[PDB]
């Protein structure tokens, strides 16, 4: 146990050993077997972690002095025995990373650091009389263990996110991000690993580990904040920026081929434009993917949020290369629906419809349809959507002033200087008035929303929230304001709403009721 | 009278004393004006045709030329004598909003 471990450690680091070296080297197989037997059988020993750390230090000293560097004459068993013990320690570390029932925090979370420090020191300590950093075999074995290491259900976290494997999360914390070369060599070994058939039939499966590996805005190809190096001599790894981007492109598309689940579908759609689309040589390859995500018409009831998420990447792709989605404003008119105000992603869509409806080549009937439908949607809505709908209607009416007949029709005004025949005609036409707005029309220009009027905002002027009602008072106020800073009005939530309500500007004193609800308190007492 | 180009028109020019060409949407249509009636329509673009103009009698193999500019980068030249067939085009570095010739 700990006694034999510390004695064998002192013997291995003492001066030299041959038979005791053989015993303390074959003892690591026994330590691996004991940990593999106690896996989900003891789960609290820490002698296993001490044995891994001690065998790491012993093999580190053995790779310092007696490594399998080269040979001159008749040392044809010492190098084979030392490399055999080092390869068995590495294979035990890879089995230790692959075989773990759950987040046991020792057998994988220390074997990862063991294989990482082993390859980090084994950059040198070979025949390489140059500037190599060749871990490639050990690294390919590391990542195939890291993707075979399936835990219980923390992969594909069915609420949101990517994967909650503890050692993979620690890897993307401090063993993937903080440098340049090991992520590049990871992408290269990944895009060699996805080409032999058995490994690719296993590697298109657990994609969530890779989503957790990538969605972090801290890549070596991303020029926002760049890194340093820990490896002694990096072998033209940072040079081929084309090779990193091309590898990133092809493994992205090749594992986007495989077993799309809806949660990680929405995850890659949300990160599609701000995270990965600059790291593509040709981003037109994703155009088919997000155009079918945009016109996704599925029977699944939560498959109505994915057009709203495909819009950002698809519009950035159109803008960078002017490709066309036909019937664009018809599809954008049918995308607004009562789901879109109750959805989680409102500000992400409305800060894009800011750009879509500011176009100088569209019609007053089109903007009329887009605000009359939005008002009939906003009459049954949270204030989170009220306070982003009504300044949007303000800015659209301010940019298309012909749409102020929906707020103010001058044919329905009774001034005191009128003919009796005029007030007669006024009474007959306001009795023979019916509004022509039809919600089931698919065409914005063919919707009669200019010929209709806009009652929903006037009804909205009496709202339970004072800030919301005083914001809706501006449609009876004049229009001296030019615009409203929609990105300042956008993401007001229930939580931040009552946060600012508890942390408001002044503080009046509360009052009491003189109503005396003595017996009947509600109508329910 | 009224000529029902179905898309919202962006430009209307007059070629003959009789026929006029309206662009709007992905196509352009030509209309005989003595008979109130459409007779050609070319929809050879991806996005909306923003503008048109027309040339006559200039030193050219083409005796007449209608060129059309279309919000996707393209400006194309159509020959009114063989049924408004496209003969040449230029691609530009962004959406082309207006065009003209000498």
């Amino acid at each position: 146990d700990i006694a034999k471990r510390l004695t064998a450690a002192g013997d291995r680091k003492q001066y030299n050993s041959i038979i005791k070296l053989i015993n303390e080297l074959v003892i690591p197989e026994n330590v691996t077997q004991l940990e593999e037997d106690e896996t989900e059988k003891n789960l609290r020993f820490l002698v296993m972690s001490l044995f891994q750390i001690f065998r790491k230090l012993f093999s580190r000293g053995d790779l310092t002095l007696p490594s399998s560097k080269k040979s001159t004459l008749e040392k044809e068993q010492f190098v084979n025995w030392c490399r055999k013990v080092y390869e068995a320690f590495k294979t035990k570390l890879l089995a230790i990373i692959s075989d773990i029932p759950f987040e046991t925090s020792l057998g994988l979370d220390s074997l990862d650091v063991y294989l990482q420090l082993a390859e980090l020191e084994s950059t040198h300590f070979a025949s390489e009389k140059g500037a190599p950093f060749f871990p490639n075999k050990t690294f390919r074995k590391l990542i195939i263990a890291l993707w075979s290491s399936n835990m219980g259900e923390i992969e594909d976290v069915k609420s949101s996110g990517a994967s909650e494997n503890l050692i993979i999360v620690e890897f993307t914390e401090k063993y993937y991000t903080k440098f340049a070369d090991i992520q590049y060599y990871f992408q290269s070994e990944f895009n060699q690993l996805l080409e032999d058939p058995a490994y690719q039939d296993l590697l298109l499966k657990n994609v969530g580990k890779w989503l957790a590996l990538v969605n972090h805005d801290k890549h070596c190809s991303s020029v926002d904040a760049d890194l340093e190096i820990f490896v002694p001599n990096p072998p033209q790894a940072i040079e081929n920026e084309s090779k990193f981007k091309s590898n990133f492109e092809k493994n992205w598309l090749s594992l986007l081929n495989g077993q799309l689940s809806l949660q990680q579908y929405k995850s890659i759609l949300l990160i599609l434009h701000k995270r990965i689309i600059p790291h593509f040589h040709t981003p037109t390859k994703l155009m088919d993917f997000l155009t079918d995500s945009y016109n996704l018409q599925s029977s699944n009831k939560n498959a109505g949020v994915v057009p709203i998420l495909a819009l950002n990447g698809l519009f950035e792709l159109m803008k960078r290369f002017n490709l066309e989605y036909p019937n664009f404003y018809m599809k954008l008119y049918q995308i607004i629906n009562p789901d879109l105000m109750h959805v989680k992603y409102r500000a992400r869509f409305f800060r894009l419809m800011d750009v879509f409806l500011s176009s100088t080549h569209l019609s007053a009937h089109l903007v009329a349809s887009f605000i009359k439908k939005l008002a009939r949607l906003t009459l049954e809505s949270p204030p989170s959507a009220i306070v982003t709908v009504i300044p949007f209607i303000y800015n659209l009416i301010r940019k298309h002033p012909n749409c102020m007949i929906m707020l103010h029709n001058p044919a329905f005004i009774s001034n005191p200087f009128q003919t009796p025949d005029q007030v007669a005609n006024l009474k007959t036409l306001k009795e023979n008035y019916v509004d022509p707005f039809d919600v089931h029309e698919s065409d914005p220009e063919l919707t009669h929303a200019l010929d209709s009027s806009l009652w929903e905002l006037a009804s909205l002027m009496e709202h339970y929230h004072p800030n919301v009602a005083t914001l809706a008072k501006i449609f009876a106020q004049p229009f001296k304001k030019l615009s409203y800073n929609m990105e300042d009005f956008l993401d007001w939530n229930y939580d931040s709403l009552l946060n600012a309500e508890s942390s408001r500007k002044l503080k009046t004193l509360p009052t009491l009721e003189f109503e005396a609800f003595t017996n009947v308190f509600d109508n329910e007492d | 009278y009224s000529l029902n180009h179905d898309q919202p028109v962006e430009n209307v020019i007059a070629v003959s004393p009789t026929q006029i060409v309206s662009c709007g949407g992905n196509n352009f249509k030509v209309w005989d004006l003595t008979s109130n009636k459409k007779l050609y329509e070319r929809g050879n673009f991806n996005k909306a045709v923003t503008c048109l103009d027309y040339v006559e009698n200039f030193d050219s193999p083409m005796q007449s030329a209608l060129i059309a500019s279309s919000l996707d980068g393209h400006v194309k030249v159509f020959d009114p004598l063989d049924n408004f067939q496209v003969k040449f085009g230029w691609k530009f570095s962004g959406p082309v909003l207006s065009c003209a010739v000498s």
Binding site: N257, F289 | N44
Partner: peptide, 17 residues
């Protein structure tokens, strides 16, 4: 859902239109 590849056929279609 998709299960075929990420192709380039919208690009090709509005190249040939």
């Amino acid at each position: 859902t998709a299960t075929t590849t990420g192709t380039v056929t919208v690009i090709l279609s509005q190249a040939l239109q």
